[PDB]
Design a protein around this ligand. Structure first.
Ligand SMILES: [Mg+2]
Length: 349
């Protein structure tokens, strides 16, 4: 099969979704200095990882402090599961804006759209968006326990004398691999590597997981590994999803395509909807694109995927774990809920 390399075979378990919905839970916010209903409006765009024998989903939670996409405060919840479907949720968010070293970048919009991957020595590396209602910035935090976090600030703060420190950035997929059943961050040609971006798929390297250097073209502009394309589901945006997976057949990148309305999109899919795709890069040259799905492997199907805070619908893939011999894929549903799909497919390592 020409698509044998992809991680497909996903199925929504019958009747279980969504697995995380909003709740009226309160916590004392150090940014507001006030008790806030931190997950009252929408719970979506989740990171996922494995810690202490369980699946952990860290979901993007929004309060009702305003109406409109990007108008409120995002904080990350902490939910655990032993079956991938039923979650036990903390009442206090595990990650949030505060009067800390990142206050200016994260106030008042908070901390959005997390992805998590883990090093071989057990360090969780969180890539997320800082939102201060001016510029979204991709930033890095680390922890050993997913609760005691150190914030290191924007991923591109230092690179090339700060060239990109005030550019709008988000949505990063670190390269990982499986060593046996254990999913860990993997160097490519001696460097840590990630795919990142929303408007195109860009990349960056690092020696230390915190300071990242975006790949550039000959003019010193961001190198576009691939881009939105006329006539396909990913015709307006190509936005990186969960961490990438280095297999024997290439580096697999799950990503989110936004469909251009009308004839320059794929009219098989709803206008403006986000449906999930996959790309494949060469293991030795990780900027060399060697595969890309013509059609999405996941699309809005249930009513809470087809419309919500985002009216045109999303299945926004962002968390992915290998647990109890299966893949559990966590995705945002129309910027409003978290859902799971499960696959038995075994990739080649
Ligand atoms: Mg093999």
């Amino acid at each position: 099969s020409e698509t044998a390399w992809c991680l497909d075979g996903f199925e929504r378990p019958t009747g279980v979704n969504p697995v995380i919905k909003p709740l009226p839970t309160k916590f004392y916010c150090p940014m507001r200095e006030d008790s806030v209903a931190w997950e009252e409006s929408d719970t979506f765009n989740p990171a996922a990882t494995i810690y202490d024998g369980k699946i952990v989903v860290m979901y993007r939670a929004e309060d009702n402090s305003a109406q409109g996409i990007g108008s409120r405060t995002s904080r990350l919840g902490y939910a655990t599961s032993t079956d991938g479907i039923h979650f036990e949720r903390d009442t206090k968010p595990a990650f949030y804006p505060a009067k800390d070293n990142q206050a200016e970048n994260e106030c008042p919009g908070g901390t959005e759209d997390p992805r998590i991957a883990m090093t071989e020595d057990g360090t969780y590396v969180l890539l997320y968006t800082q939102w201060n209602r001016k510029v979204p910035r991709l930033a890095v935090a680390t922890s050993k326990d997913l609760k005691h976090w150190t914030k290191f600030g924007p991923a591109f703060e230092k690179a090339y004398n700060g060239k990109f420190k005030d550019e709008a950035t988000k949505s990063a997929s670190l390269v990982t691999t499986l060593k046996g059943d254990k999913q860990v961050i993997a160097k490519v040609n001696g460097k840590y590597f990630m795919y990142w971006g929303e408007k195109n798929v860009y990349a960056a390297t690092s020696d230390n997981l915190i300071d990242w250097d975006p790949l550039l073209d000959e003019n010193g502009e961001l190198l576009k590994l691939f881009s939105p394309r006329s006539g396909y589901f990913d015709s307006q945006l190509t936005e990186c999803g969960p961490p990438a997976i280095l297999t024997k057949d290439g580096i697999v990148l799950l990503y989110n395509g936004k469909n251009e309305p009308g004839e320059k999109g794929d009219t098989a899919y709803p206008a403006n909807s986000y449906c999930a795709g996959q790309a494949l890069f060469d293991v030795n040259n990780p900027t060399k694109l060697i595969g890309r799905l013509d059609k999405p492997f996941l699309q809005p199907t249930d009513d809470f995927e087809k419309s919500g805070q985002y009216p045109a619908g999303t299945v926004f893939v962002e968390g992915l774990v290998y647990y109890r011999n299966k893949w559990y894929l966590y995705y945002g549903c129309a910027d409003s809920f978290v859902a799971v799909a499960v696959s038995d497919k075994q990739l080649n390592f």
